[model samples]
Target: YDIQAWKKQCEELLNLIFQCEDSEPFRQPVDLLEYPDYRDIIDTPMDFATVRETLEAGNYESPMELCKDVRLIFSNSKAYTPSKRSRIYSMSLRLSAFFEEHISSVLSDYKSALRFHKR
Candidate 1:
């Protein structure tokens, strides 16, 4: 299924995201002490660092599985931060936009290759 190739693509995407200026706050898990409500509100908290580790550990079952976690990083921020005007809220949107823009091609090519392999 060329799953290895898809994993490589995800690594590349993570690298790009890590280099983003607005991505610093999202690089790791949020401090629960700073916002104790975080754990209570978010059922599945995800961060870029955790995503990378999960990827390297080969825990992801599919490309979409990884995608969901990446999306959750932003969605969780949007949900927790009450004000959309806040820096974290805005940066989450920015990072999400960047990820979404790049992920389409990765998914597209993976699906295309999967179809070709099956045929």
Candidate 2:
């Protein structure tokens, strides 16, 4: 699979999700105050959108609602082929884990910026 293309597509989907002004379209507000928490939501938008577009595109729901649908997709066997599903699942898990780990390192490097009234 074209992992780079997949990553780019996913990133674009996330940018759209973040840019989307229709907060009521999702089950909950996508909290963007911090990168770590926001990254999780951003990283999963494509997966969420795929399932959501199939199940509830017209429904006015919260981000949490869309999240629940995405979780359902992850649990469904029909979503993937047996031969390569594990790899995809593992990749997603590892990527999320890496992102979490990296966020702290990233924040730490920018600690000066995090200080209040740092001007």
Q: Which candidate ranks first by TM-score, i.e. highest?
A: 1
lDDT scores of the candidates, listed in order? 0.88, 0.39
What lDDT is reached at residue 102 by model 1? Answer: 89
Best by lDDT: 1
Worst 10 residues of 1 by lDDT: 1-10
Pairs that collide in candidate 2 are: 26-61, 26-62, 26-63, 27-61, 27-62, 27-63, 28-62, 28-63
In candidate 2, what residue range of length 10 has the lowest lDDT sum? 1-10
The TM-score of candidate 2 is 0.29
- Tens digit of per-residue lDDT, candidate 2, span 1-118: 2212222333344454445443223333333563345443344433434543443344522233433554443333223324544654555444444434433433343443335335
Q: Write the per-residue lDDT of candidate 1 for residues 13-116, one digit (tens) a residue.
A: 99999999989988989989889888889898789999999999989977888999988888899889889899989989988888899899778887887888
